[PDB]
Amino acid sequence: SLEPVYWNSANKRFQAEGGYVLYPQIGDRLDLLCPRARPPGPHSSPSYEFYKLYLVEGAQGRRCEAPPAPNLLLTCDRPDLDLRFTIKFQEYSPNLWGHEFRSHHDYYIIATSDGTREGLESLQGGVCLTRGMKVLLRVGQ
């Protein structure tokens, strides 16, 4: 099925060949995690890396560029706490914006921050370029 996506440099699934591509099925869940990295357990990185993850149109995903008023999924503010976000590929959601997942379309989960507290609000390719931190999502027809 689908595995948790850990959002730090320590992942390395990012520095992979094709480039972190998930093919979720309609009905699939997905977790994006920002693990403690304060009392440093497994899966955490050298030091806490401050990120904002956006879901992006794929076209913009390639260009490593969030649009204005982007679709912010998760905000790794807290180096003290484990953070998570879960999607289900379904018609219902506690989301109130009315976003929708075209099938046969490409979406990216990107982080345009340089990974620093001062670079957090950056809306244009940061670690998305630097460490190649994006994930393509191709959702079952």
Binding site: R29, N71, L83, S93, N95, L96
Partner: protein, 505 residues
């Protein structure tokens, strides 16, 4: 903000991990970014195209915290089913809410028939498009209550029958009456009653520096607030009214009895006491009586009456005096007569009146200014000390001086003046001269002169007391003939009228 949370699904950061039947393909857990731009844990189901749906979701065990009536707030959204691909028909727009009381906090399975239906909850509103940017408040909010609850805790369950629904948050709470101080009495936090037609009797303890005069009680209503206050707790002696607790009287203030009125300042001639005093103490030289009220000022000690008139008989003696000069501030003025027998013999030292001296009006503490002493031995010289006594004088030190007069027993009364003479005659004043009587029979102390108009009706006699052998008349109309009568007065007795001198102005 007057309600205690028994469960809030928004507070859970990891996962709710509630049990669901079926465990997959029915209710499912997903995160969202909420109205407060905060990630929360939600439950949803959207099996609208599948028939005969009976999807159960069940919370973890929730403790009551002993509250018999509990409120359940469900915020949810309904995706318009006709916005979904293929779905043509009428949409399911409701779900059902149930509960189950249990002492057991780890029920393993959903036993459908054991759950009790609270209500069918309806979506006021549905949506067709997810909200992208800022959260617009179009969620449905439905509140229901359950109770009276009997057991330690309970489970909430939701039944979906084929809607496209997301439970955004579930909040379970009880109300409550807040900790408030009214009518100078403390009231603790009390939970609302199990029924709307039932009121909770709340009796709270009063402040440590206050005494309970009337039993205080309040009625905690179902809305989470008190109704009618009955019974007020009055502040203790030496403590005034304040926003919180009974504040003590400041330096120079007192409060004798428990009254609603604030601390009053110390009365005149009273020493200032420390913070929180019952009554302002009196300084040196001033003392307050036991029977006298705390509101009255400290008194001054009384004064002795300067003038003393004494008339003697063969065996008895009559005494008379005027009102005291300085009252001190008390209505209760008494007089004490003390026998001395110091008159007999030239030396200062003497023997006290050991014998039974009888005086008919009162023995000690007479209110009247006139007294008469009887059964006194003839040929013996006596002296009486008329000592003025006040209500405070007992507590106060013995007054420094008391006016006294020395008298004789066997010796008579004084005789009359042989002749009187007018020295100066004018239209405004007429001078008078006279000699002492032929037989004194004692030491002369006073001379009383009487005036009465002739040719007209008898006017009230003019009284002029002069110890000197000369006096002058004042304020008289011209051409008015006047008769002047002099009378010698001693402690030994009463004198006789003088020569009638008819002098025309």
């Amino acid at each position: 903000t007057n309600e205690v949370t028994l469960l809030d699904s928004r507070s859970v950061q990891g996962e709710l991990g509630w049990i669901a039947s079926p465990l997959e393909g029915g209710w499912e857990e997903v995160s969202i970014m909420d109205e407060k731009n905060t990630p929360i844990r939600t439950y949803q189901v959207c099996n609208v195209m599948e028939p005969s749906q009976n999807n159960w979701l069940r919370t973890d065990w929730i403790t009551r915290e002993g509250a018999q009536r509990v409120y359940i707030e469900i915020k949810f959204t309904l995706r318009d089913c006709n916005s979904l691909p293929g779905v043509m028909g009428t949409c399911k727009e409701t779900f059902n809410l149930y509960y189950y009381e249990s002492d057991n906090d780890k029920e393993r399975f959903i036993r459908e028939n054991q759950f009790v239906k609270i209500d069918t909850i309806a979506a006021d509103e549905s949506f067709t498009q997810v909200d992208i940017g800022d959260r617009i408040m179009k969620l449905n909010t439905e509140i229901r209550d359950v109770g009276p609850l009997s057991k330690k805790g309970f489970y909430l369950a939701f039944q979906d029958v084929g809607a496209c629904i997301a439970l955004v948050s579930v909040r379970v709470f009880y109300k409550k009456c807040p900790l408030t101080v009214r009518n100078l009495a403390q009231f603790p936090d009390t939970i609302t009653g199990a029924d709307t037609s039932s009121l909770v009797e709340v009796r709270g303890s009063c402040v440590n520096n206050s005494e309970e005069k009337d039993v205080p009680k309040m009625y905690c209503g179902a809305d989470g607030e008190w109704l009618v206050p009955i019974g007020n707790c009055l502040c203790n002696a030496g403590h005034e009214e304040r926003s919180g607790e009974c504040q003590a009287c400041k330096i120079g203030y007192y409060k004798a009895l428990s009254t609603d009125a604030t601390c009053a300042k110390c009365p005149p001639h009273s020493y200032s006491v420390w913070e929180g005093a019952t009554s302002c103490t009196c300084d040196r030289g001033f003392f307050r009586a036991d029977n006298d009220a705390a509101s009255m000022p400290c008194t001054r000690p009384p004064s002795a009456p300067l003038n003393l008139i004494s008339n003697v008989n063969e065996t008895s003696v009559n005494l008379e005096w005027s009102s005291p000069q300085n009252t001190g501030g008390r209505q209760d003025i008494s007089y004490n007569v003390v026998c001395k027998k110091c008159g007999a013999g030239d030396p200062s030292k003497c023997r006290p009146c050991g014998s039974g001296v009888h005086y008919t009006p009162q023995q000690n503490g007479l209110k009247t200014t006139k007294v008469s002493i009887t059964d006194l031995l003839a040929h013996t010289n006596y002296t009486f000390e008329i000592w003025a006594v006040n209500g405070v004088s007992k507590y106060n030190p013995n007054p420094d001086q008391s006016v006294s007069v020395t008298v004789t027993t066997n010796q008579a009364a004084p005789s009359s003046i042989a002749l009187v003479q007018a020295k100066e005659v004018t239209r405004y004043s007429v001078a008078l001269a006279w000699l002492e009587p032929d037989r004194p029979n004692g030491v002369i102390l006073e001379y009383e002169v009487k005036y009465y108009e002739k040719d007209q009706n008898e006017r009230s006699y003019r009284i002029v007391r002069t110890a000197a052998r000369n006096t002058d008349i004042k304020g008289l109309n011209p051409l008015t003939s006047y008769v002047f009568h002099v009378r010698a007065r001693t402690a030994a007795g009463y004198g006789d009228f003088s020569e009638p001198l008819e002098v025309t102005t």
